[PDB]
Amino acid sequence: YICGDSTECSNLLLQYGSFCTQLNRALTGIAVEQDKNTQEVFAQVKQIYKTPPIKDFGGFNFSQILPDPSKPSKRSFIEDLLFNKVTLDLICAQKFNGLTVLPPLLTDEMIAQYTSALLAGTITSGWTFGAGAALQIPFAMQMAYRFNGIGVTQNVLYENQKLIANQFNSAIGKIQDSLSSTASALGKLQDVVNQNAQALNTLVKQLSSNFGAISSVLNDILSRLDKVEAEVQIDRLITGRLQSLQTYVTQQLIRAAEIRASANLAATKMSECVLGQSKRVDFCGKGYHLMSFPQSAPHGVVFLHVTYVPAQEKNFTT
């Protein structure tokens, strides 16, 4: 990128030391951290649990979130909506100037398998499978004990069982079309991609500058000038381009720091909410938390929080 081929420019660049190495090293560190983030967030189960045979959960329809048994691709329904919502010419210009984009380690199909295992394990065994060996238990019992976890005596659930079912399958429906109406919710994913572009479309057009030289293309300088003015006019181009590269690298380092912090929050949220029951208020949205379901998304994670809200108050004297 600094030299644009040709030997004279590299010959000069050799005299500027080895600035050219440590920026490679920093970018390498960024990429390795990027791998480690996802691997640490999603691999909190060591066993690939299969989707359970037959479907009977007392009236709870799970057909939307569980993966399609017929589709060879394992993206679920809501996952299809998401993977179609977020998108991802200067793309070839990036490769034309040595800006290499590297493939991510896991395949998004493997992310589908991981999350599918998480869903199957949670709905088939409660919170026990996070402790060690998985132990099965009927779903209605799990819902009863999860109520008892927040102080409501379990008998309540049974005497209202059917009613409760009617709500859940409705509520998810209200979510479904929601995502297909507005995608402003996915903006916190979209920005993560968008910023990247604004960097590169700068870094490339940064080549059009001069820094005081007489032509912004190295070959024009070499063709027009002799062997003694070449150094005095090309040193300024070298300095400017090295400056631009340093600026880009520093921006990447900072943005990686913020993304890493958010990834740690995602890991904590996955461990505390999906894999158990938490008393921490407002850590799972409004109201008392009951349970959770994770879903994949382009370089991101979606959580569905299922909570309990009272209503229709009455006065009494105490």
Partner 1 sequence: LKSFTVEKGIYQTSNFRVQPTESIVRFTNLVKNKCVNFNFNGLTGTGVLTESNKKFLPFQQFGRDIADTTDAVRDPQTLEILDITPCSFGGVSVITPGTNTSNQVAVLYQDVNCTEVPVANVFQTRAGCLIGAEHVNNSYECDIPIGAGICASYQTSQSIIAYTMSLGAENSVAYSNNSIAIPTNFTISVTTEILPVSMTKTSVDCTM
Partner 2 sequence: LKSFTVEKGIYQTSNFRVQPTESIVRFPNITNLCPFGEVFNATRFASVYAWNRKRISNCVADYSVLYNSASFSTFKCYGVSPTKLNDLCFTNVYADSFVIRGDEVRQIAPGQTGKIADYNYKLPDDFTGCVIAWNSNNLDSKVGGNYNYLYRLFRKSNLKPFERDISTEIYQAGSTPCNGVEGFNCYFPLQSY
Ligand X SMILES: *[C@@H]1O[C@H](CO)[C@@H](O[C@@H]2O[C@H](CO)[C@@H](O)[C@H](O)[C@H]2NC(C)=O)[C@H](O)[C@H]1NC(C)=O
Ligand Y SMILES: *[C@@H]1O[C@H](CO)[C@@H](O)[C@H](O)[C@H]1NC(C)=O
Contact residues toward partner 2 (CB under 8 A) are 223-229
Nearer to partner 2, 179 or 242 (CB): 242
Q: What are the φ/ψ torsions at residue 122 (nearest 5 degrees)?
A: -65, -45
Q: Smallest Cα–Cα separation from 66: which of 287, 314, 295, 253?
A: 295
Among residue numbers 22 through 41, which ones bind ligand X (CB under 6 A)?
Answer: none
Count of beta carbons in the 10 Å neighbourhood of residue 273? 21
Give the per-residue contact string, 256-295, with ligand Y (x = CB under 6 A; - = no). ----------------------------------------
Nearer to partner 1, 178 or 210 (CB): 210
Nearer to partner 2, 232 or 253 (CB): 232
Q: Smallest Cα–Cα separation from 253: which of 35, 25, 41, 17?
A: 25
Supply the DSSP symbol for 23.
H
Contact 49, 134 (CB under 8 A): yes
Position 315 contacts ligand Y (CB under 6 A): yes
Token pair for 132? 């060690």
Contact 200, 90 (CB under 8 A): yes
Count of beta carbons in the 10 Å neighbourhood of residue 164? 17
Give the per-residue contact string, 244-283, with its own copies (x = CB under 8 A; - = no). x-xx--xx-xx--xx--x------x--xx--xx-xxxxxx
Among residue numbers 147 through 176, which ones bind partner 1 (CB under 8 A)?
Answer: none
Give the C-alpha separation, 112 to 258, whole Å: 26
Give the C-alpha separation, 260 to 40, whole Å: 11
Site residues (CB under 6 A) for ligand X?
61, 63
Site residues (CB under 6 A) for ligand Y?
313, 315
Site residues (CB under 8 A) for its own copies?
15-19, 22, 26, 44, 127, 130-133, 135, 137-138, 141, 202, 205-206, 208-212, 240, 244, 246-247, 250-251, 253-254, 257-258, 261, 268, 271-272, 275-276, 278-283, 286-288, 309-311, 313, 318
